[PDB]
Design a protein around this ligand. Sequence first.
Ligand SMILES: Nc1ncnc2c1ncn2[C@@H]1O[C@H](COP(=O)(O)OP(=O)(O)OP(=O)(O)O)[C@@H](O)[C@H]1O
Ligand SMILES: Nc1ncnc2c1ncn2[C@@H]1O[C@H](COP(=O)(O)OP(=O)(O)OP(=O)(O)O)[C@@H](O)[C@H]1O
Ligand SMILES: *[C@@H]1O[C@H](CO)[C@@H](O)[C@H](O)[C@H]1NC(C)=O
Ligand SMILES: *[C@@H]1O[C@H](CO)[C@@H](O)[C@H](O)[C@H]1NC(C)=O
Ligand SMILES: [Mg+2]
Ligand SMILES: [Mg+2]
Length: 1566
Amino acid sequence: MAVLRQLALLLWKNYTLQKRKVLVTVLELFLPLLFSGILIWLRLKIQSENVPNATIYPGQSIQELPLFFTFPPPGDTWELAYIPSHSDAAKTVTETVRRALVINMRVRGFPSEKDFEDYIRYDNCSSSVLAAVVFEHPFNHSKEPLPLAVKYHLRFSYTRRNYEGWHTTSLFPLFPNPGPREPTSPDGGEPGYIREGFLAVQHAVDRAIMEYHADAATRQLFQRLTVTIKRFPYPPFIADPFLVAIQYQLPLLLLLSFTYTALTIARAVVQEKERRLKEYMRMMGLSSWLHWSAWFLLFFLFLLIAASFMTLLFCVKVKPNVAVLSRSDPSLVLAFLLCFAISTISFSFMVSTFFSKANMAAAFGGFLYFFTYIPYFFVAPRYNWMTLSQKLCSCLLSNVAMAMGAQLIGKFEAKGMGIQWRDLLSPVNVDDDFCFGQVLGMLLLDSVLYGLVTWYMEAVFPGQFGVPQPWYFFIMPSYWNEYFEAEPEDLVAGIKIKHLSKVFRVGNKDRAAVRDLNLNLYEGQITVLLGHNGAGKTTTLSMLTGLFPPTSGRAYISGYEISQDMVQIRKSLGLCPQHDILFDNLTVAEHLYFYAQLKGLSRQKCPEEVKQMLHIIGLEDKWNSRSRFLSGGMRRKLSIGIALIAGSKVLILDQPTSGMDAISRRAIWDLLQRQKSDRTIVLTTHFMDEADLLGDRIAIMAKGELQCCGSSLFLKQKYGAGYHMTLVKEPHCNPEDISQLVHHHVPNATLESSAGAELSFILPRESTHRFEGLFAKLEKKQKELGIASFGASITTMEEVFLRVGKLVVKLNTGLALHCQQFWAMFLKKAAYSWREWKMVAAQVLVPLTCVTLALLAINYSSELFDDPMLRLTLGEYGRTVVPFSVPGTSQLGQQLSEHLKDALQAEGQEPREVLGDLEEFLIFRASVEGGGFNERCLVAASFRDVGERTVVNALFNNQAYHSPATALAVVDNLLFKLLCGPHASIVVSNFPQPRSALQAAKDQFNEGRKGFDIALNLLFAMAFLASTFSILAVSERAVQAKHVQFVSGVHVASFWLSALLWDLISFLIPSLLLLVVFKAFDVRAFTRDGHMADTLLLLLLYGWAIIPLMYLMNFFFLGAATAYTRLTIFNILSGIATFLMVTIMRIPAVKLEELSKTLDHVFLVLPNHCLGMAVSSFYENYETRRYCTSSEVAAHYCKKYNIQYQENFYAWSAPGVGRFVASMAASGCAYLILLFLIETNLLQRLLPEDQDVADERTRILALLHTPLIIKELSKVYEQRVPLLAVDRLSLAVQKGECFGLLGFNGAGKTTTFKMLTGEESLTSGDAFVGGHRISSDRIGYCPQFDALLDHMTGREMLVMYARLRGIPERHIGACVENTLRGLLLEPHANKLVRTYSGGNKRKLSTGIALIGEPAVIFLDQPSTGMDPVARRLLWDTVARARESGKAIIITSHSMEECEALCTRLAIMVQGQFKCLGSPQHLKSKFGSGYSLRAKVQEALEEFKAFVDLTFPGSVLEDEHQGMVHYHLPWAKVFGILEKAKEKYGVDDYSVSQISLEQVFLSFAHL
Ligand SMILES: Nc1ncnc2c1ncn2[C@@H]1O[C@H](COP(=O)(O)OP(=O)(O)OP(=O)(O)O)[C@@H](O)[C@H]1O
Ligand SMILES: Nc1ncnc2c1ncn2[C@@H]1O[C@H](COP(=O)(O)OP(=O)(O)OP(=O)(O)O)[C@@H](O)[C@H]1O
Ligand SMILES: *[C@@H]1O[C@H](CO)[C@@H](O)[C@H](O)[C@H]1NC(C)=O
Ligand SMILES: *[C@@H]1O[C@H](CO)[C@@H](O)[C@H](O)[C@H]1NC(C)=O
Ligand SMILES: [Mg+2]
Ligand SMILES: [Mg+2]
């Protein structure tokens, strides 16, 4: 029941996410209609004729040869032959035949048929033979007589001889058009059969047989009757030349409308597992088959609306009874489209499981969809030769199975009835056995076949974020030291780690991340894991939670062996990652509700729980606000809320409180204290008071190995000595002054590190007596040496970490500046094709296999074979009916009709007397029966007499090919039977002659579709190649690595021209690899006289005109993968769709050619259309020029009909590419201009507060040496409820200073930096940096969130910014080493900044903002994920950069740096300042410069008595069950605690001058 209660949850989530992008949804829901509207518009344009009256034809006469064979061929006379030559009968028959055909002819003779075939194809005196009678009889010893039952062939020519062959491969034309097959020519048609004298010779031989058998009765017979042949009259019809036009590319219009959802599904499924959003929901509890179901139900509704709109505008009558698919029962069309939609969803699901990156999934799942359709180019021509097995074997691809259904829809449509639910098992004609149900069967078998592949790949090859399974997973039935403390035996071990390890694949050396871990974490207490930046701590936690498998070892979360069955562990797991994983466009209460329901919590008690969590975390006013906005410190709060909601037995937190203010860290600490009773908790943290306040056992990792493990006291009394003391010096101070005094008073002590203004000391316990003197000595003389805010404590935790770690120039400008900024960007872009070589592979191979498989299917479909033998008899068609009439009541007419009646019934046919004027009966039945009349009535007879002489008409249905011969054979059969015995028949066959070798080398015309196919398969390749030039340009702006580059001062021309130049170089390679292909296949129009350069010019000119456009179009998008799949469809609409429409709309048969001019003039502004038409015209012009020049015999024919070719190849006139070249050349310039006009913002114009805060608003309002000036600055975010983020924020900073700018979470800091730099827009304010105003018109920038290029390494990212700011090439190695070494990045100097750590990216992002020595510097939380050792080096760098006169404005949350390197603090809340002045000013506000902090109900209450009766006037606050904090109103308070510990029950204490954090907390209740 939970499964159905969770499927509804997933569906609700998908519906909510879709509801908030309606423009995108409506847009992509009506893209499939721009391909099916082409047809519904063409159907209004093209019109019918409706011929009203029937068509009649006159008879012929087959007594003699046509009036063309009386003239002998040039050179000799006509020649005749017979195959059995060793028999006298076979010669005496042919002699009679020769006499009958009264011309000059000569006979021959051969010993077999093989000799005749060779003489035809291996000689030159041949090719004058007329026919060749072949008798199929054994014929012993030249004395055998002709049997009663004779049969023979007639070998006629292979070419149309009487001014395509004989079509003996089929009985009906493949695709028939309405009206008579040959409207004129009342003598037959395409195979002729009367022009070539087939009927004449056949009748002569049929009479020769009778003259041989009787010779006396046959003369008396053939003196009173003659046989003549007529044609059926055709009924009235309508003309409508529509279906014939759109028949070859109906499948290409059905595929090209589902293509978009095909390449949307593939990347929408992959970029939500590349984003770690699938592993996250699986970790929190989610069945993997409830996700596929949600995806399927999401993507089936779209294709159900689209498949209904297509069915709607495939059946509605636009004009009375005219609609597309004029009669096809819309139900079955809809069923076909649904059966295609299911399959094209399953195919995308299967494809998406081969890729792990959304870019390659989008670039290779839109290509595989079309790649699956290519083998139809080899099936369409040779469809009449395949077998049913070979037709079902090629239906295993869904696109081919759709193509061979869209073919039958046309074939059934242009015949009669169409598609009707009662023909699912009956083929079209009597020649192919292929039903329509066999298409729907394979289209539904393919879905299952693809599902069985997506079920296996998703389980054995999970990619980069899953934990795999063995290759046989379906077989089993269960699928369906002395630094280390001594472990406690009073607890239960939750997690047990044993010899765990992990090795990565950097370079070729197998560097290790974790190595041989051993640990045990117990239930009911918190274990804190410490370490520096890059020593496990996330590889361990990502391996305990199943994000990727261990290299070796094992671990037992609850006895479950994480590598064996983690599906049981993930029932009670709950975690928060280092970088949050949230849904944009999904509010906060929605997030909490969804993730409480997912885990299992009941629906009754959910809302109160969500309210409790919203109150706890602190997100109250941010309720129902989208996660995309938030702040930066609220993201972590929401993540923690999600992690703790619904309860969990195992909590795994990875840096939870990183980026929050203190007032909320305390609340998080309190909750974690209250929720550790009966669960295990694992923490990784970088604040060293957190690891002491809330921690029962602590572990520290050096470089993948465990250093120490134990409680918080055993560790302190092993590494420190006795105590600690810290100081903060003033500007004019010297360390030796303090050091010598300390040595003279306290001998044994060692300075730790003077990291800025810290200058700390370490003292042992053996010198505890000499404390008061040294304390008073510095108490009295604070001002002399400049010590502000001194403090002392007892061996804090921050020192144990240090002990463990230690134990183991004139800048370029002018020309040389631009020549350097250009080279830097050129290398930045070029190093992107070296690191992701999959993209360059897709750029070089995709455009090539689409052309080498279209030139391969053009050579293949251009060959003829043999014209097999056909048996000309009724009975090849089935059970036909054969009407006849005998009007005239005369003898010899009924005694023939009775023979006709009996012979057919013996054959198996059905006669039908009419008695009533055969012609009108035929016309009426042909109009009432419909299209089924052509399959059951094919011959007829009428026995009429004219003046004592009988005339036998032999009608034939010309809708079939071989009807005349069949009719004449039926007549001659009964004629032979009349005068001989009833067992006497004649059987005739065609079997034409074979083609020779000399006559098979004519091949003059080749235009046909041979240029159209090349130009179409080039467009389908350049649609995919040309979309890859916007991937880097979008992914470099989504990360906001472009905003920092422009802040650092890159000229726009330098940014864009180098990108254009590298893209042109990258585009040149396929344009040079296409020439090799055109040479290999010997395509003449692009290989001959000088056209090799003219083709490359076309390709390079298209590459010049599309590349600037793919830069303009990239401004819409925010994602790199979701821009490929929309630019690809933009390149198809403006390409193939229009080219396909214009080619159809210029056929002579359809009477609309003039409109294809006013459309072709509009489509010139589209750069994809121009290339296709240019290639097509270049191909057509070469052929029409090579034909009107070969000989004068064709030169006059060319001007007979005005073939109209060009000699220039570049003229303006039609068959010359002048205007296409002009329009492609004038588009690149018009796009570069428009891009440079938009990149330079030229198309953009087209209350009693504190006194000190109020004084700054006047000192600047009532300045040449000030780098930065802010006055009356404001910012409002309008969201139907305006939110004021900045309120007048007036202030000014001078040189050599360090402004503080503190605040709470979400107050104003980042949104201030944005306006200062230029990211966001201004409203009612002004400011000046470096003097020059920013409201109208050398600074560094370290943004809050890392904006780095993942394909570059650490040192290259620094070299780029060294080049962007002068720094001559000579003096650059020193300037890079000084920044890598002085920031502790030497180990990671060149390691591809994509595999860096959480803090190893903050180090680099800070090092970028300081290299080059800029004037102003904007730091924005520079140190969040940095450990103490590196956080101290950051302070040294910031101080040494400020002592050299540079304005600096940091923005941080920790306080020990805000007092170690700051000079003018400012606490701002709700978007306005509340205090300014030096930190000493703030601290000496209300005096009482003494504080305390102890650490241990009854014990604390008793220990409060001592400090209450000893320190009256206490204002104590903020206790943490031991952390009672005292703000007393120096050697007189440290000496007190020299005996009050034995009877006070404490272990540590810190007494110091008043804390800055207390001043900060004083503003809390506001
Ligand atoms: N996908 C990866 N490919 C190659 N090496 C990696 C990959 N991920 C991490 N590493 C390396 O393995 C080591 C593991 O570091 P890890 O990220 O676990 O440290 P961390 O504790 O998360 O750092 P921080 O304290 O900043 O959070 C790092 O030195 C890192 O360089
Ligand atoms: N793009 C935006 N659209 C609408 N509102 C926003 C946007 N960005 C921030 N806000 C809102 O305006 C306020 C300003 O947030 P700001 O960026 O100053 O937070 P912050 O002080 O940088 O947080 P932290 O210092 O913890 O990172 C926030 O409370 C936030 O809710
Ligand atoms: C072609 O035929 C002629 C006579 O018809 C003959 O003289 C000539 O040799 C033949 N060609 C060849 C190559 O033998
Ligand atoms: C003569 O023809 C018959 C066929 O009727 C055949 O069986 C026989 O072999 C032939 N005679 C000889 C000598 O082969
Ligand atoms: Mg980490
Ligand atoms: Mg911020």
